[PDB]
């Protein structure tokens, strides 16, 4: 599970998909995530490389 | 429930007590809260004013 410490500031996801660490919201490949999330949960998806 | 965002950056609690909105972590008044918290849950406490 990817943590977001103070040094990471902001992160962006381009390829793959993501899920929230609190309510498990699905996230599209190209999209900004703002900062309301805490941790990033990856997944095994053979359709696209994250 | 107090929310956090980019405008308010960092916040500090001085008087009272607080509880995390994620894992119910109780915290006293004279300490920092780092950033791992996202929402602040107040409570009714007549012993001290928050």
PDB file of N, CA and C in Angstrom:
ATOM      1  N   UNK A   1       0.851  -1.182   0.000  1.00  0.00           N
ATOM      2  CA  UNK A   1       0.000   0.000   0.000  1.00  0.00           C
ATOM      3  C   UNK A   1       0.889   1.235   0.000  1.00  0.00           C
ATOM      4  N   UNK A   2       0.738   2.071  -1.025  1.00  0.00           N
ATOM      5  CA  UNK A   2       1.553   3.271  -1.165  1.00  0.00           C
ATOM      6  C   UNK A   2       1.095   4.327  -0.168  1.00  0.00           C
ATOM      7  N   UNK A   3       2.016   4.772   0.679  1.00  0.00           N
ATOM      8  CA  UNK A   3       1.769   5.859   1.610  1.00  0.00           C
ATOM      9  C   UNK A   3       2.126   7.195   0.967  1.00  0.00           C
ATOM     10  N   UNK A   4       1.548   8.260   1.507  1.00  0.00           N
ATOM     11  CA  UNK A   4       1.772   9.614   1.010  1.00  0.00           C
ATOM     12  C   UNK A   4       2.281  10.432   2.192  1.00  0.00           C
ATOM     13  N   UNK A   5       3.601  10.509   2.334  1.00  0.00           N
ATOM     14  CA  UNK A   5       4.215  11.295   3.394  1.00  0.00           C
ATOM     15  C   UNK A   5       4.313  12.753   2.947  1.00  0.00           C
ATOM     16  N   UNK A   6       4.933  13.594   3.777  1.00  0.00           N
ATOM     17  CA  UNK A   6       5.031  15.015   3.462  1.00  0.00           C
ATOM     18  C   UNK A   6       5.944  15.291   2.277  1.00  0.00           C
ATOM     19  N   UNK A   7       6.907  14.407   2.003  1.00  0.00           N
ATOM     20  CA  UNK A   7       7.839  14.650   0.908  1.00  0.00           C
ATOM     21  C   UNK A   7       7.200  14.405  -0.453  1.00  0.00           C
ATOM     22  N   UNK A   8       6.187  13.539  -0.521  1.00  0.00           N
ATOM     23  CA  UNK A   8       5.591  13.187  -1.805  1.00  0.00           C
ATOM     24  C   UNK A   8       4.670  14.268  -2.356  1.00  0.00           C
ATOM     25  N   UNK A   9       4.216  15.200  -1.516  1.00  0.00           N
ATOM     26  CA  UNK A   9       3.362  16.302  -1.950  1.00  0.00           C
ATOM     27  C   UNK A   9       2.135  15.802  -2.705  1.00  0.00           C
ATOM     28  N   UNK A  10       2.202  15.818  -4.035  1.00  0.00           N
ATOM     29  CA  UNK A  10       1.100  15.405  -4.890  1.00  0.00           C
ATOM     30  C   UNK A  10       1.559  14.304  -5.837  1.00  0.00           C
ATOM     31  N   UNK A  11       0.632  13.403  -6.166  1.00  0.00           N
ATOM     32  CA  UNK A  11       0.903  12.289  -7.063  1.00  0.00           C
ATOM     33  C   UNK A  11      -0.195  12.235  -8.119  1.00  0.00           C
ATOM     34  N   UNK A  12       0.146  11.654  -9.267  1.00  0.00           N
ATOM     35  CA  UNK A  12      -0.773  11.532 -10.392  1.00  0.00           C
ATOM     36  C   UNK A  12      -0.690  10.115 -10.941  1.00  0.00           C
ATOM     37  N   UNK A  13      -1.839   9.572 -11.335  1.00  0.00           N
ATOM     38  CA  UNK A  13      -1.933   8.245 -11.927  1.00  0.00           C
ATOM     39  C   UNK A  13      -2.350   8.382 -13.384  1.00  0.00           C
ATOM     40  N   UNK A  14      -1.678   7.639 -14.267  1.00  0.00           N
ATOM     41  CA  UNK A  14      -1.896   7.738 -15.702  1.00  0.00           C
ATOM     42  C   UNK A  14      -2.393   6.427 -16.296  1.00  0.00           C
ATOM     43  N   UNK A  15      -1.807   5.300 -15.896  1.00  0.00           N
ATOM     44  CA  UNK A  15      -2.142   4.001 -16.463  1.00  0.00           C
ATOM     45  C   UNK A  15      -2.550   3.044 -15.354  1.00  0.00           C
ATOM     46  N   UNK A  16      -3.583   2.249 -15.615  1.00  0.00           N
ATOM     47  CA  UNK A  16      -4.079   1.291 -14.646  1.00  0.00           C
ATOM     48  C   UNK A  16      -5.352   1.747 -13.963  1.00  0.00           C
ATOM     49  N   UNK A  17      -5.555   1.315 -12.720  1.00  0.00           N
ATOM     50  CA  UNK A  17      -6.707   1.745 -11.941  1.00  0.00           C
ATOM     51  C   UNK A  17      -6.332   1.727 -10.466  1.00  0.00           C
ATOM     52  N   UNK A  18      -7.104   2.462  -9.671  1.00  0.00           N
ATOM     53  CA  UNK A  18      -6.812   2.652  -8.261  1.00  0.00           C
ATOM     54  C   UNK A  18      -8.088   2.523  -7.441  1.00  0.00           C
ATOM     55  N   UNK A  19      -7.907   2.262  -6.147  1.00  0.00           N
ATOM     56  CA  UNK A  19      -9.010   2.167  -5.203  1.00  0.00           C
ATOM     57  C   UNK A  19      -8.673   2.961  -3.950  1.00  0.00           C
ATOM     58  N   UNK A  20      -9.688   3.608  -3.381  1.00  0.00           N
ATOM     59  CA  UNK A  20      -9.497   4.396  -2.175  1.00  0.00           C
ATOM     60  C   UNK A  20      -9.235   3.486  -0.977  1.00  0.00           C
ATOM     61  N   UNK A  21      -8.600   4.054   0.043  1.00  0.00           N
ATOM     62  CA  UNK A  21      -8.256   3.317   1.250  1.00  0.00           C
ATOM     63  C   UNK A  21      -9.332   3.387   2.326  1.00  0.00           C
ATOM     64  N   UNK A  22     -10.393   4.166   2.116  1.00  0.00           N
ATOM     65  CA  UNK A  22     -11.459   4.313   3.100  1.00  0.00           C
ATOM     66  C   UNK A  22     -12.781   3.736   2.612  1.00  0.00           C
ATOM     67  N   UNK A  23     -13.274   4.195   1.462  1.00  0.00           N
ATOM     68  CA  UNK A  23     -14.540   3.729   0.910  1.00  0.00           C
ATOM     69  C   UNK A  23     -14.368   2.981  -0.406  1.00  0.00           C
ATOM     70  N   UNK A  24     -13.126   2.696  -0.803  1.00  0.00           N
ATOM     71  CA  UNK A  24     -12.825   1.836  -1.950  1.00  0.00           C
ATOM     72  C   UNK A  24     -13.468   2.356  -3.234  1.00  0.00           C
ATOM     73  N   UNK A  25     -13.244   3.633  -3.534  1.00  0.00           N
ATOM     74  CA  UNK A  25     -13.750   4.204  -4.776  1.00  0.00           C
ATOM     75  C   UNK A  25     -12.862   3.801  -5.946  1.00  0.00           C
ATOM     76  N   UNK A  26     -13.483   3.336  -7.026  1.00  0.00           N
ATOM     77  CA  UNK A  26     -12.748   3.011  -8.236  1.00  0.00           C
ATOM     78  C   UNK A  26     -12.286   4.290  -8.933  1.00  0.00           C
ATOM     79  N   UNK A  27     -11.075   4.239  -9.488  1.00  0.00           N
ATOM     80  CA  UNK A  27     -10.460   5.395 -10.123  1.00  0.00           C
ATOM     81  C   UNK A  27      -9.995   5.011 -11.521  1.00  0.00           C
ATOM     82  N   UNK A  28     -10.357   5.845 -12.491  1.00  0.00           N
ATOM     83  CA  UNK A  28      -9.979   5.658 -13.884  1.00  0.00           C
ATOM     84  C   UNK A  28      -8.484   5.904 -14.060  1.00  0.00           C
ATOM     85  N   UNK A  29      -7.975   5.543 -15.238  1.00  0.00           N
ATOM     86  CA  UNK A  29      -6.543   5.674 -15.472  1.00  0.00           C
ATOM     87  C   UNK A  29      -6.137   7.149 -15.513  1.00  0.00           C
ATOM     88  N   UNK A  30      -6.603   7.966 -16.486  1.00  0.00           N
ATOM     89  CA  UNK A  30      -6.236   9.386 -16.447  1.00  0.00           C
ATOM     90  C   UNK A  30      -7.174  10.195 -15.564  1.00  0.00           C
ATOM     91  N   UNK A  31      -6.707  10.610 -14.386  1.00  0.00           N
ATOM     92  CA  UNK A  31      -7.548  11.373 -13.474  1.00  0.00           C
ATOM     93  C   UNK A  31      -6.703  11.874 -12.313  1.00  0.00           C
ATOM     94  N   UNK A  32      -6.991  13.093 -11.864  1.00  0.00           N
ATOM     95  CA  UNK A  32      -6.383  13.604 -10.644  1.00  0.00           C
ATOM     96  C   UNK A  32      -7.202  13.172  -9.432  1.00  0.00           C
ATOM     97  N   UNK A  33      -6.507  12.906  -8.329  1.00  0.00           N
ATOM     98  CA  UNK A  33      -7.118  12.309  -7.148  1.00  0.00           C
ATOM     99  C   UNK A  33      -7.279  13.313  -6.015  1.00  0.00           C
ATOM    100  N   UNK A  34      -6.934  14.576  -6.244  1.00  0.00           N
ATOM    101  CA  UNK A  34      -6.977  15.622  -5.204  1.00  0.00           C
ATOM    102  C   UNK A  34      -6.088  15.147  -4.049  1.00  0.00           C
ATOM    103  N   UNK A  35      -6.497  15.346  -2.794  1.00  0.00           N
ATOM    104  CA  UNK A  35      -5.703  14.864  -1.670  1.00  0.00           C
ATOM    105  C   UNK A  35      -6.556  14.233  -0.572  1.00  0.00           C
ATOM    106  N   UNK A  36      -7.850  14.008  -0.818  1.00  0.00           N
ATOM    107  CA  UNK A  36      -8.718  13.433   0.206  1.00  0.00           C
ATOM    108  C   UNK A  36      -8.355  11.986   0.515  1.00  0.00           C
ATOM    109  N   UNK A  37      -7.494  11.373  -0.299  1.00  0.00           N
ATOM    110  CA  UNK A  37      -7.104   9.989  -0.052  1.00  0.00           C
ATOM    111  C   UNK A  37      -5.893   9.937   0.877  1.00  0.00           C
ATOM    112  N   UNK A  38      -5.785   8.828   1.606  1.00  0.00           N
ATOM    113  CA  UNK A  38      -4.649   8.556   2.478  1.00  0.00           C
ATOM    114  C   UNK A  38      -3.638   7.618   1.842  1.00  0.00           C
ATOM    115  N   UNK A  39      -4.068   6.427   1.435  1.00  0.00           N
ATOM    116  CA  UNK A  39      -3.176   5.402   0.925  1.00  0.00           C
ATOM    117  C   UNK A  39      -3.690   4.911  -0.420  1.00  0.00           C
ATOM    118  N   UNK A  40      -2.771   4.426  -1.248  1.00  0.00           N
ATOM    119  CA  UNK A  40      -3.099   3.926  -2.576  1.00  0.00           C
ATOM    120  C   UNK A  40      -2.939   2.411  -2.581  1.00  0.00           C
ATOM    121  N   UNK A  41      -4.001   1.708  -2.968  1.00  0.00           N
ATOM    122  CA  UNK A  41      -4.018   0.252  -3.008  1.00  0.00           C
ATOM    123  C   UNK A  41      -3.940  -0.207  -4.457  1.00  0.00           C
ATOM    124  N   UNK A  42      -2.841  -0.866  -4.814  1.00  0.00           N
ATOM    125  CA  UNK A  42      -2.706  -1.413  -6.153  1.00  0.00           C
ATOM    126  C   UNK A  42      -3.473  -2.728  -6.261  1.00  0.00           C
ATOM    127  N   UNK A  43      -3.418  -3.333  -7.445  1.00  0.00           N
ATOM    128  CA  UNK A  43      -4.152  -4.559  -7.718  1.00  0.00           C
ATOM    129  C   UNK A  43      -3.505  -5.261  -8.901  1.00  0.00           C
ATOM    130  N   UNK A  44      -3.775  -6.559  -9.009  1.00  0.00           N
ATOM    131  CA  UNK A  44      -3.283  -7.371 -10.117  1.00  0.00           C
ATOM    132  C   UNK A  44      -4.276  -7.277 -11.268  1.00  0.00           C
ATOM    133  N   UNK A  45      -3.918  -6.518 -12.303  1.00  0.00           N
ATOM    134  CA  UNK A  45      -4.758  -6.348 -13.484  1.00  0.00           C
ATOM    135  C   UNK A  45      -3.903  -6.585 -14.721  1.00  0.00           C
ATOM    136  N   UNK A  46      -4.215  -7.644 -15.466  1.00  0.00           N
ATOM    137  CA  UNK A  46      -3.485  -7.958 -16.686  1.00  0.00           C
ATOM    138  C   UNK A  46      -3.955  -7.147 -17.886  1.00  0.00           C
ATOM    139  N   UNK A  47      -5.107  -6.477 -17.788  1.00  0.00           N
ATOM    140  CA  UNK A  47      -5.597  -5.677 -18.906  1.00  0.00           C
ATOM    141  C   UNK A  47      -4.672  -4.501 -19.195  1.00  0.00           C
ATOM    142  N   UNK A  48      -4.208  -3.815 -18.153  1.00  0.00           N
ATOM    143  CA  UNK A  48      -3.327  -2.668 -18.310  1.00  0.00           C
ATOM    144  C   UNK A  48      -2.262  -2.690 -17.225  1.00  0.00           C
ATOM    145  N   UNK A  49      -1.098  -2.141 -17.553  1.00  0.00           N
ATOM    146  CA  UNK A  49      -0.005  -2.024 -16.593  1.00  0.00           C
ATOM    147  C   UNK A  49      -0.152  -0.732 -15.797  1.00  0.00           C
ATOM    148  N   UNK A  50      -0.162  -0.795 -14.465  1.00  0.00           N
ATOM    149  CA  UNK A  50      -0.327   0.429 -13.668  1.00  0.00           C
ATOM    150  C   UNK A  50       0.979   1.207 -13.590  1.00  0.00           C
TER     151      UNK A  50
ATOM    152  N   UNK B   1     -17.646  17.756  12.064  1.00  0.00           N
ATOM    153  CA  UNK B   1     -16.335  17.157  11.855  1.00  0.00           C
ATOM    154  C   UNK B   1     -15.492  18.126  11.041  1.00  0.00           C
ATOM    155  N   UNK B   2     -14.343  18.513  11.587  1.00  0.00           N
ATOM    156  CA  UNK B   2     -13.465  19.452  10.905  1.00  0.00           C
ATOM    157  C   UNK B   2     -12.743  18.749   9.763  1.00  0.00           C
ATOM    158  N   UNK B   3     -12.850  19.309   8.564  1.00  0.00           N
ATOM    159  CA  UNK B   3     -12.154  18.770   7.408  1.00  0.00           C
ATOM    160  C   UNK B   3     -10.830  19.493   7.202  1.00  0.00           C
ATOM    161  N   UNK B   4      -9.936  18.854   6.454  1.00  0.00           N
ATOM    162  CA  UNK B   4      -8.642  19.427   6.105  1.00  0.00           C
ATOM    163  C   UNK B   4      -8.549  19.513   4.588  1.00  0.00           C
ATOM    164  N   UNK B   5      -7.825  20.517   4.101  1.00  0.00           N
ATOM    165  CA  UNK B   5      -7.636  20.728   2.676  1.00  0.00           C
ATOM    166  C   UNK B   5      -6.382  21.566   2.466  1.00  0.00           C
ATOM    167  N   UNK B   6      -6.140  21.935   1.207  1.00  0.00           N
ATOM    168  CA  UNK B   6      -4.921  22.658   0.864  1.00  0.00           C
ATOM    169  C   UNK B   6      -4.885  24.063   1.449  1.00  0.00           C
ATOM    170  N   UNK B   7      -6.044  24.702   1.630  1.00  0.00           N
ATOM    171  CA  UNK B   7      -6.060  26.084   2.102  1.00  0.00           C
ATOM    172  C   UNK B   7      -5.558  26.197   3.537  1.00  0.00           C
ATOM    173  N   UNK B   8      -5.933  25.255   4.400  1.00  0.00           N
ATOM    174  CA  UNK B   8      -5.600  25.335   5.816  1.00  0.00           C
ATOM    175  C   UNK B   8      -4.277  24.664   6.169  1.00  0.00           C
ATOM    176  N   UNK B   9      -3.628  23.997   5.212  1.00  0.00           N
ATOM    177  CA  UNK B   9      -2.302  23.419   5.408  1.00  0.00           C
ATOM    178  C   UNK B   9      -2.217  22.564   6.667  1.00  0.00           C
ATOM    179  N   UNK B  10      -1.677  23.136   7.742  1.00  0.00           N
ATOM    180  CA  UNK B  10      -1.467  22.434   8.999  1.00  0.00           C
ATOM    181  C   UNK B  10      -2.266  23.100  10.110  1.00  0.00           C
ATOM    182  N   UNK B  11      -2.724  22.285  11.059  1.00  0.00           N
ATOM    183  CA  UNK B  11      -3.499  22.754  12.199  1.00  0.00           C
ATOM    184  C   UNK B  11      -2.904  22.157  13.467  1.00  0.00           C
ATOM    185  N   UNK B  12      -3.069  22.873  14.579  1.00  0.00           N
ATOM    186  CA  UNK B  12      -2.550  22.454  15.875  1.00  0.00           C
ATOM    187  C   UNK B  12      -3.648  22.605  16.919  1.00  0.00           C
ATOM    188  N   UNK B  13      -3.723  21.641  17.832  1.00  0.00           N
ATOM    189  CA  UNK B  13      -4.664  21.663  18.944  1.00  0.00           C
ATOM    190  C   UNK B  13      -3.907  22.013  20.218  1.00  0.00           C
ATOM    191  N   UNK B  14      -4.497  22.882  21.042  1.00  0.00           N
ATOM    192  CA  UNK B  14      -3.843  23.399  22.235  1.00  0.00           C
ATOM    193  C   UNK B  14      -4.574  22.999  23.510  1.00  0.00           C
ATOM    194  N   UNK B  15      -5.906  23.026  23.499  1.00  0.00           N
ATOM    195  CA  UNK B  15      -6.698  22.749  24.689  1.00  0.00           C
ATOM    196  C   UNK B  15      -7.781  21.726  24.378  1.00  0.00           C
ATOM    197  N   UNK B  16      -8.014  20.821  25.326  1.00  0.00           N
ATOM    198  CA  UNK B  16      -9.039  19.805  25.184  1.00  0.00           C
ATOM    199  C   UNK B  16      -8.488  18.433  24.855  1.00  0.00           C
ATOM    200  N   UNK B  17      -9.207  17.690  24.018  1.00  0.00           N
ATOM    201  CA  UNK B  17      -8.748  16.393  23.539  1.00  0.00           C
ATOM    202  C   UNK B  17      -9.425  16.111  22.207  1.00  0.00           C
ATOM    203  N   UNK B  18      -8.858  15.171  21.455  1.00  0.00           N
ATOM    204  CA  UNK B  18      -9.349  14.888  20.115  1.00  0.00           C
ATOM    205  C   UNK B  18      -9.316  13.391  19.854  1.00  0.00           C
ATOM    206  N   UNK B  19     -10.067  12.974  18.837  1.00  0.00           N
ATOM    207  CA  UNK B  19     -10.105  11.587  18.401  1.00  0.00           C
ATOM    208  C   UNK B  19      -9.995  11.529  16.886  1.00  0.00           C
ATOM    209  N   UNK B  20      -9.216  10.570  16.395  1.00  0.00           N
ATOM    210  CA  UNK B  20      -9.055  10.394  14.959  1.00  0.00           C
ATOM    211  C   UNK B  20     -10.354   9.910  14.327  1.00  0.00           C
ATOM    212  N   UNK B  21     -10.573  10.321  13.081  1.00  0.00           N
ATOM    213  CA  UNK B  21     -11.737   9.898  12.314  1.00  0.00           C
ATOM    214  C   UNK B  21     -11.489   8.619  11.527  1.00  0.00           C
ATOM    215  N   UNK B  22     -10.325   7.995  11.690  1.00  0.00           N
ATOM    216  CA  UNK B  22      -9.968   6.779  10.974  1.00  0.00           C
ATOM    217  C   UNK B  22      -9.898   5.556  11.875  1.00  0.00           C
ATOM    218  N   UNK B  23      -9.127   5.622  12.965  1.00  0.00           N
ATOM    219  CA  UNK B  23      -8.917   4.465  13.831  1.00  0.00           C
ATOM    220  C   UNK B  23      -9.239   4.765  15.292  1.00  0.00           C
ATOM    221  N   UNK B  24     -10.010   5.821  15.559  1.00  0.00           N
ATOM    222  CA  UNK B  24     -10.412   6.189  16.920  1.00  0.00           C
ATOM    223  C   UNK B  24      -9.202   6.370  17.833  1.00  0.00           C
ATOM    224  N   UNK B  25      -8.183   7.062  17.334  1.00  0.00           N
ATOM    225  CA  UNK B  25      -6.979   7.318  18.115  1.00  0.00           C
ATOM    226  C   UNK B  25      -7.184   8.560  18.974  1.00  0.00           C
ATOM    227  N   UNK B  26      -7.201   8.376  20.292  1.00  0.00           N
ATOM    228  CA  UNK B  26      -7.355   9.495  21.209  1.00  0.00           C
ATOM    229  C   UNK B  26      -6.031  10.229  21.374  1.00  0.00           C
ATOM    230  N   UNK B  27      -6.101  11.557  21.395  1.00  0.00           N
ATOM    231  CA  UNK B  27      -4.925  12.410  21.512  1.00  0.00           C
ATOM    232  C   UNK B  27      -5.228  13.536  22.489  1.00  0.00           C
ATOM    233  N   UNK B  28      -4.246  13.851  23.330  1.00  0.00           N
ATOM    234  CA  UNK B  28      -4.378  14.900  24.331  1.00  0.00           C
ATOM    235  C   UNK B  28      -4.192  16.265  23.671  1.00  0.00           C
ATOM    236  N   UNK B  29      -4.221  17.326  24.475  1.00  0.00           N
ATOM    237  CA  UNK B  29      -4.173  18.684  23.946  1.00  0.00           C
ATOM    238  C   UNK B  29      -2.769  19.128  23.533  1.00  0.00           C
ATOM    239  N   UNK B  30      -1.724  18.996  24.381  1.00  0.00           N
ATOM    240  CA  UNK B  30      -0.448  19.631  24.034  1.00  0.00           C
ATOM    241  C   UNK B  30       0.449  18.748  23.182  1.00  0.00           C
ATOM    242  N   UNK B  31       0.041  18.476  21.944  1.00  0.00           N
ATOM    243  CA  UNK B  31       0.851  17.656  21.055  1.00  0.00           C
ATOM    244  C   UNK B  31       0.456  17.932  19.612  1.00  0.00           C
ATOM    245  N   UNK B  32       1.365  17.604  18.698  1.00  0.00           N
ATOM    246  CA  UNK B  32       1.111  17.729  17.269  1.00  0.00           C
ATOM    247  C   UNK B  32       0.320  16.509  16.796  1.00  0.00           C
ATOM    248  N   UNK B  33      -0.308  16.613  15.626  1.00  0.00           N
ATOM    249  CA  UNK B  33      -1.154  15.540  15.114  1.00  0.00           C
ATOM    250  C   UNK B  33      -0.584  14.993  13.812  1.00  0.00           C
ATOM    251  N   UNK B  34       0.566  15.514  13.397  1.00  0.00           N
ATOM    252  CA  UNK B  34       1.201  15.137  12.125  1.00  0.00           C
ATOM    253  C   UNK B  34       0.199  15.418  11.000  1.00  0.00           C
ATOM    254  N   UNK B  35       0.185  14.581   9.961  1.00  0.00           N
ATOM    255  CA  UNK B  35      -0.765  14.740   8.871  1.00  0.00           C
ATOM    256  C   UNK B  35      -1.624  13.498   8.651  1.00  0.00           C
ATOM    257  N   UNK B  36      -1.273  12.363   9.266  1.00  0.00           N
ATOM    258  CA  UNK B  36      -1.958  11.101   8.987  1.00  0.00           C
ATOM    259  C   UNK B  36      -3.453  11.162   9.289  1.00  0.00           C
ATOM    260  N   UNK B  37      -3.931  12.259   9.879  1.00  0.00           N
ATOM    261  CA  UNK B  37      -5.364  12.425  10.086  1.00  0.00           C
ATOM    262  C   UNK B  37      -5.957  13.261   8.955  1.00  0.00           C
ATOM    263  N   UNK B  38      -7.207  12.971   8.614  1.00  0.00           N
ATOM    264  CA  UNK B  38      -7.933  13.715   7.591  1.00  0.00           C
ATOM    265  C   UNK B  38      -9.124  14.485   8.133  1.00  0.00           C
ATOM    266  N   UNK B  39      -9.818  13.951   9.134  1.00  0.00           N
ATOM    267  CA  UNK B  39     -10.947  14.641   9.731  1.00  0.00           C
ATOM    268  C   UNK B  39     -10.798  14.623  11.244  1.00  0.00           C
ATOM    269  N   UNK B  40     -11.253  15.699  11.876  1.00  0.00           N
ATOM    270  CA  UNK B  40     -11.152  15.873  13.319  1.00  0.00           C
ATOM    271  C   UNK B  40     -12.549  15.809  13.919  1.00  0.00           C
ATOM    272  N   UNK B  41     -12.738  14.909  14.878  1.00  0.00           N
ATOM    273  CA  UNK B  41     -14.025  14.698  15.528  1.00  0.00           C
ATOM    274  C   UNK B  41     -14.001  15.347  16.905  1.00  0.00           C
ATOM    275  N   UNK B  42     -14.827  16.372  17.093  1.00  0.00           N
ATOM    276  CA  UNK B  42     -14.955  17.008  18.393  1.00  0.00           C
ATOM    277  C   UNK B  42     -15.837  16.161  19.307  1.00  0.00           C
ATOM    278  N   UNK B  43     -15.953  16.590  20.561  1.00  0.00           N
ATOM    279  CA  UNK B  43     -16.745  15.866  21.545  1.00  0.00           C
ATOM    280  C   UNK B  43     -17.129  16.820  22.665  1.00  0.00           C
ATOM    281  N   UNK B  44     -18.181  16.451  23.391  1.00  0.00           N
ATOM    282  CA  UNK B  44     -18.624  17.223  24.546  1.00  0.00           C
ATOM    283  C   UNK B  44     -17.801  16.827  25.765  1.00  0.00           C
ATOM    284  N   UNK B  45     -17.037  17.776  26.299  1.00  0.00           N
ATOM    285  CA  UNK B  45     -16.196  17.537  27.469  1.00  0.00           C
ATOM    286  C   UNK B  45     -16.233  18.785  28.338  1.00  0.00           C
ATOM    287  N   UNK B  46     -16.872  18.683  29.503  1.00  0.00           N
ATOM    288  CA  UNK B  46     -16.953  19.805  30.427  1.00  0.00           C
ATOM    289  C   UNK B  46     -15.683  19.994  31.245  1.00  0.00           C
ATOM    290  N   UNK B  47     -14.788  19.003  31.262  1.00  0.00           N
ATOM    291  CA  UNK B  47     -13.551  19.137  32.026  1.00  0.00           C
ATOM    292  C   UNK B  47     -12.666  20.241  31.463  1.00  0.00           C
ATOM    293  N   UNK B  48     -12.534  20.310  30.139  1.00  0.00           N
ATOM    294  CA  UNK B  48     -11.710  21.319  29.492  1.00  0.00           C
ATOM    295  C   UNK B  48     -12.401  21.807  28.228  1.00  0.00           C
ATOM    296  N   UNK B  49     -12.177  23.075  27.905  1.00  0.00           N
ATOM    297  CA  UNK B  49     -12.713  23.660  26.681  1.00  0.00           C
ATOM    298  C   UNK B  49     -11.777  23.369  25.514  1.00  0.00           C
ATOM    299  N   UNK B  50     -12.272  22.792  24.418  1.00  0.00           N
ATOM    300  CA  UNK B  50     -11.392  22.485  23.282  1.00  0.00           C
ATOM    301  C   UNK B  50     -11.141  23.729  22.440  1.00  0.00           C
TER     302      UNK B  50
END
